[PDB]
PDB file of C-alpha atoms in Angstrom:
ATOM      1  CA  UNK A   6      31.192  44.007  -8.714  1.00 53.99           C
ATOM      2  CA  UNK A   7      33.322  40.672  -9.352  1.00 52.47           C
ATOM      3  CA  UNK A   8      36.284  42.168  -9.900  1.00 51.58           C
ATOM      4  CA  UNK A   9      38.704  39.446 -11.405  1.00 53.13           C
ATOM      5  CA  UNK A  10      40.086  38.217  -8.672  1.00 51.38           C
ATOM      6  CA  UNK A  11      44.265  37.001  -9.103  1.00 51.29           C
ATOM      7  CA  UNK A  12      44.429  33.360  -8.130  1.00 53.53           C
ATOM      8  CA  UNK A  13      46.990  32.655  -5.259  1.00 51.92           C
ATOM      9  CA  UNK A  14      48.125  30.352  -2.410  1.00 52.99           C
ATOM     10  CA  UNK A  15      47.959  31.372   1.278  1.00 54.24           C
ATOM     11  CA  UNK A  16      50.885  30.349   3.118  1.00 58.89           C
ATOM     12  CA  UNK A  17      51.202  30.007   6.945  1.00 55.75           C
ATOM     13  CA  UNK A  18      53.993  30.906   8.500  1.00 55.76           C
ATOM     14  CA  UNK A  19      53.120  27.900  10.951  1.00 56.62           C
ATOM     15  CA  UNK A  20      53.600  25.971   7.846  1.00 58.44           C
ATOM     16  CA  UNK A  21      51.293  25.283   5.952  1.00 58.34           C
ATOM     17  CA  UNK A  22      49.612  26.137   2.736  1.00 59.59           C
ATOM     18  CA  UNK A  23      46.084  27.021   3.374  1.00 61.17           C
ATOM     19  CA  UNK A  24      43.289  24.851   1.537  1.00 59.67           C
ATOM     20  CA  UNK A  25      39.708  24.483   1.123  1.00 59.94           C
ATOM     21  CA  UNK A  26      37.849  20.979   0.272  1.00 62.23           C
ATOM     22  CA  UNK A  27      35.521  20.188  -2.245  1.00 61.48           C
ATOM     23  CA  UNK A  28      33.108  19.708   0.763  1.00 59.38           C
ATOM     24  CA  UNK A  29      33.888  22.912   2.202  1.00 57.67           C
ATOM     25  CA  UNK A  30      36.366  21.547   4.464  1.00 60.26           C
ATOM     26  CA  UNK A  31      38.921  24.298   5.162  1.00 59.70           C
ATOM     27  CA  UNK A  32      42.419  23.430   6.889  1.00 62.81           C
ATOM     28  CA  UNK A  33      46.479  23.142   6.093  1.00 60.08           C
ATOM     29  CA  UNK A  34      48.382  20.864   4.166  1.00 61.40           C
ATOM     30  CA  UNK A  35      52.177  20.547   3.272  1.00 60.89           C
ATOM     31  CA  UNK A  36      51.106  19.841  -0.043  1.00 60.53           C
ATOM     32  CA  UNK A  37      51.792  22.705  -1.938  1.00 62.55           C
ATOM     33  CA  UNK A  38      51.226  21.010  -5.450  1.00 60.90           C
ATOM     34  CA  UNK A  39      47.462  19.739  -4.454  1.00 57.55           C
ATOM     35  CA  UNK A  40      44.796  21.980  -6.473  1.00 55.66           C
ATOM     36  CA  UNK A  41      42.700  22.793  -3.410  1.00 60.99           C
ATOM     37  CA  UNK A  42      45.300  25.068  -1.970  1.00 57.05           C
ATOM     38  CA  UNK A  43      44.509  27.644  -4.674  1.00 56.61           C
ATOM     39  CA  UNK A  44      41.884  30.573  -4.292  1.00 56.46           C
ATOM     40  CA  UNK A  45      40.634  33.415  -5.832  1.00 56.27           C
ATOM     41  CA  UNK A  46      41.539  36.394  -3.997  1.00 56.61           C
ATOM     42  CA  UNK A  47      38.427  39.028  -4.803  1.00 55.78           C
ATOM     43  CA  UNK A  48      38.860  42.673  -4.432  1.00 57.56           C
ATOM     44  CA  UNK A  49      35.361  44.082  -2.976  1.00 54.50           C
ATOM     45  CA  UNK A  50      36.460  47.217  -1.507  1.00 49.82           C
ATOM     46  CA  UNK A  51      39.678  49.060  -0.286  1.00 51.44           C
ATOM     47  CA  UNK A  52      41.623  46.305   1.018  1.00 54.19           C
ATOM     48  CA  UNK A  53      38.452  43.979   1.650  1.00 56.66           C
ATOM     49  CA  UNK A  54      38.415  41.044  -0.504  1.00 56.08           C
ATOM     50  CA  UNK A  55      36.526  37.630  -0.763  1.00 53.60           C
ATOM     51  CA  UNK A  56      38.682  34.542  -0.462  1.00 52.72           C
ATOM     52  CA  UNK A  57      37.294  31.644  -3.112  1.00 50.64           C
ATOM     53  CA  UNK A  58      38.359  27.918  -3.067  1.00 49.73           C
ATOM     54  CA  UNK A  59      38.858  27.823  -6.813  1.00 49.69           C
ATOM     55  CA  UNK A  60      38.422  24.050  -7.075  1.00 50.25           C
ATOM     56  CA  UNK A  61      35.627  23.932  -4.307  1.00 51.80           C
ATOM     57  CA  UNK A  62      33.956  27.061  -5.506  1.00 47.56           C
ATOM     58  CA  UNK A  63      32.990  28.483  -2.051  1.00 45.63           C
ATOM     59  CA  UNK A  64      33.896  31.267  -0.312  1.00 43.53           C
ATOM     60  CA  UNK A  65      35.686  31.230   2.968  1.00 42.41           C
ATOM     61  CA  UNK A  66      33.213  33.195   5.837  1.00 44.66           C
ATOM     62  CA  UNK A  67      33.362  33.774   9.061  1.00 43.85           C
ATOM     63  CA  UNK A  68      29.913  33.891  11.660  1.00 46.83           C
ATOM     64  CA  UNK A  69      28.943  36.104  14.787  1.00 45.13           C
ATOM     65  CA  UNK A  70      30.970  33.858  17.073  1.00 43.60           C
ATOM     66  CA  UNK A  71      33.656  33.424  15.429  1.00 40.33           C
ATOM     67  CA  UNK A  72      33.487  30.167  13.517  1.00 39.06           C
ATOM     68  CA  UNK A  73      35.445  30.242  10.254  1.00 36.59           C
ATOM     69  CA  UNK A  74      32.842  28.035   7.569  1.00 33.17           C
ATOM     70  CA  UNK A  75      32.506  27.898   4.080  1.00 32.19           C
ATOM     71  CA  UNK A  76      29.907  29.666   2.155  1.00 34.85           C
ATOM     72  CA  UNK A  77      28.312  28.824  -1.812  1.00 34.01           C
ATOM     73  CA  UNK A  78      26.672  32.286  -1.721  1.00 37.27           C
ATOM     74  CA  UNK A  79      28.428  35.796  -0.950  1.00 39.44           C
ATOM     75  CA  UNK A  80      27.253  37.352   2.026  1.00 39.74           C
ATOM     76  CA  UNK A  81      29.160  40.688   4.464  1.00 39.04           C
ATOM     77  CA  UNK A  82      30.594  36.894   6.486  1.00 39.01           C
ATOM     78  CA  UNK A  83      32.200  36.660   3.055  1.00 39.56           C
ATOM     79  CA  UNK A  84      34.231  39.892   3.580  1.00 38.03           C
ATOM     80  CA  UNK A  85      38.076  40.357   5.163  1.00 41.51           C
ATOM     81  CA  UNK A  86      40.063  42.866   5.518  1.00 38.26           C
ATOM     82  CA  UNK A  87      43.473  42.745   4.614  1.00 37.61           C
ATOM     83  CA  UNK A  88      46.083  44.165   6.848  1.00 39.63           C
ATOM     84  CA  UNK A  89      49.681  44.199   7.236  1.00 37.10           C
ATOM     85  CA  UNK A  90      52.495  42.943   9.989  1.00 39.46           C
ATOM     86  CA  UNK A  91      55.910  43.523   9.813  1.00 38.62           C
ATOM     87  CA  UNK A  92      55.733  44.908   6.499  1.00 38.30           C
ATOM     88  CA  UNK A  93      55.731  41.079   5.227  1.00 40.80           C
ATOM     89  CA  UNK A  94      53.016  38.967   6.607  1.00 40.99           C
ATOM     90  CA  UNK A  95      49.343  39.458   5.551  1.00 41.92           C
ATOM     91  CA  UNK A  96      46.431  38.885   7.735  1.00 42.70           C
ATOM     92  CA  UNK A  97      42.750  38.640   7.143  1.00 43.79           C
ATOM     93  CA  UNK A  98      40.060  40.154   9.658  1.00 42.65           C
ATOM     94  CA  UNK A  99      36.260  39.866  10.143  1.00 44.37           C
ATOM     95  CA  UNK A 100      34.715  43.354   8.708  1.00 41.51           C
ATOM     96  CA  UNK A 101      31.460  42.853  10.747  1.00 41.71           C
ATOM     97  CA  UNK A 102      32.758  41.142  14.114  1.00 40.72           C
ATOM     98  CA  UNK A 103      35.399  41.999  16.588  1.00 41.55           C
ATOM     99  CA  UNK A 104      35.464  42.050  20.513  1.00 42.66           C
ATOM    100  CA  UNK A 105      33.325  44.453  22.196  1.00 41.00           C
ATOM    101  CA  UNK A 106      34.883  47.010  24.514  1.00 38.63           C
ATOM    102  CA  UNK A 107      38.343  46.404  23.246  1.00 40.15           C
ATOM    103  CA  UNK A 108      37.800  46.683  20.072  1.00 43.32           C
ATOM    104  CA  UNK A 109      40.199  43.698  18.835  1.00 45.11           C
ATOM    105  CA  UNK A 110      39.732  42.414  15.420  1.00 44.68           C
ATOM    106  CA  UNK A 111      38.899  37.984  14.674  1.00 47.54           C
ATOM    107  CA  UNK A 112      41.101  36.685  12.268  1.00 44.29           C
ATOM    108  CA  UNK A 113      41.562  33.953   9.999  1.00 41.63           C
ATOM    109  CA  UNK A 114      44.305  31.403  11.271  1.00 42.01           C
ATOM    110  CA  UNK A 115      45.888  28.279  11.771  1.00 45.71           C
ATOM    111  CA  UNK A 116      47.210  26.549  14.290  1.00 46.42           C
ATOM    112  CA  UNK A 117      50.894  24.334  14.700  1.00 45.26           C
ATOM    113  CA  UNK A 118      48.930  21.494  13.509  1.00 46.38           C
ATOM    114  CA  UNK A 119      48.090  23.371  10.819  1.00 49.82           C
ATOM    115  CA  UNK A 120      44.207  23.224  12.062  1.00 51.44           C
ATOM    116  CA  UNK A 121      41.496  26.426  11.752  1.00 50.71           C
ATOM    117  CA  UNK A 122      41.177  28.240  15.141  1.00 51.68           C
ATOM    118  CA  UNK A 123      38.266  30.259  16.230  1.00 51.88           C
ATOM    119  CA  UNK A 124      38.379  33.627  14.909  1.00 55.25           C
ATOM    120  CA  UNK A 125      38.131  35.540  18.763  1.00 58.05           C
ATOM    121  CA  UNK A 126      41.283  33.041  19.382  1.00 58.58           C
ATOM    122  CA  UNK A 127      43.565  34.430  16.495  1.00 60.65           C
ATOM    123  CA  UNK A 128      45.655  37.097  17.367  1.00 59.96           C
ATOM    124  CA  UNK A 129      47.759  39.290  14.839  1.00 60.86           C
ATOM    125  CA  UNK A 130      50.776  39.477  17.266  1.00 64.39           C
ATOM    126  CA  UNK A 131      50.595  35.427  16.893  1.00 64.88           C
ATOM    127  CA  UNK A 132      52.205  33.816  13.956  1.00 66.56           C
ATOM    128  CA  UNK A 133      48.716  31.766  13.735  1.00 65.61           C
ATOM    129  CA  UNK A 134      47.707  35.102  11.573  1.00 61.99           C
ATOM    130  CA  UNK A 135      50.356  35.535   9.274  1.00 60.04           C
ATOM    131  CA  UNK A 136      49.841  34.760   5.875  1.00 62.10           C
ATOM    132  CA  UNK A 137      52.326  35.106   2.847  1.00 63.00           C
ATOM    133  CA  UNK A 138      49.948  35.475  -0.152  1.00 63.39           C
ATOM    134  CA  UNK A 139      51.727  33.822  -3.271  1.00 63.55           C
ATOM    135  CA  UNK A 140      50.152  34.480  -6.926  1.00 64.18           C
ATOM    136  CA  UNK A 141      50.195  31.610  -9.665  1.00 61.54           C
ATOM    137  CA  UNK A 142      51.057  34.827 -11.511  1.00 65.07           C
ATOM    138  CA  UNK A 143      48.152  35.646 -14.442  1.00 68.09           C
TER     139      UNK A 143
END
């Protein structure tokens, strides 16, 4: 279950296009033209897909407090769901961790700097969430 996954670009509405280093390094950059801002975007379930550096080959995760990392090997931290705001924006949760009692979901996200936030600090009212995914087109 590798579904082919289409290869796009993952841009913030803070501004930036999201981007993942060779070293597993994963941030923003203006850059839209620089090969590390594409990944593979991996359906593994309904809506749940795996996001994959295509020139770093690693997978972005997230752990049980919240830290967005990069991972060689697929693992459940590997997973997010994809939801939608205002019918336009995309944004990618945790499938394993959320807060307890209330029930809200960690998200990937980016700050004005253009800088990876902790998950737990990532709202999806907050444009640090909103993603516009943009295929290469295959």
């Amino acid at each position: 279950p590798q579904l082919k996954g289409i290869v796009t670009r993952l841009f913030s509405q803070q501004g930036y296009f999201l981007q993942m280093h060779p070293d597993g390094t994963i941030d923003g950059t203006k850059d839209e033209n620089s090969d590390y801002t594409l990944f593979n975007l991996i359906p593994v379930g309904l809506r749940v897909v795996a996001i994959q550096g295509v020139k770093a080959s690693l997978y972005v995760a997230m752990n049980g407090e919240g830290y967005l990392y990069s991972s060689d090997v697929f693992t459940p931290e590997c997973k997010f769901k994809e939801s939608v705001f205002e019918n336009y924006y995309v944004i990618y949760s945790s499938t394993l961790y959320r807060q307890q009692e209330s029930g809200r979901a960690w998200f990937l996200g980016l700050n004005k700097e253009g800088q990876i936030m902790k998950g737990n600090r990532v709202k999806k009212t907050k444009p640090s969430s909103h993603f516009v995914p943009k295929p290469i087109e295959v």
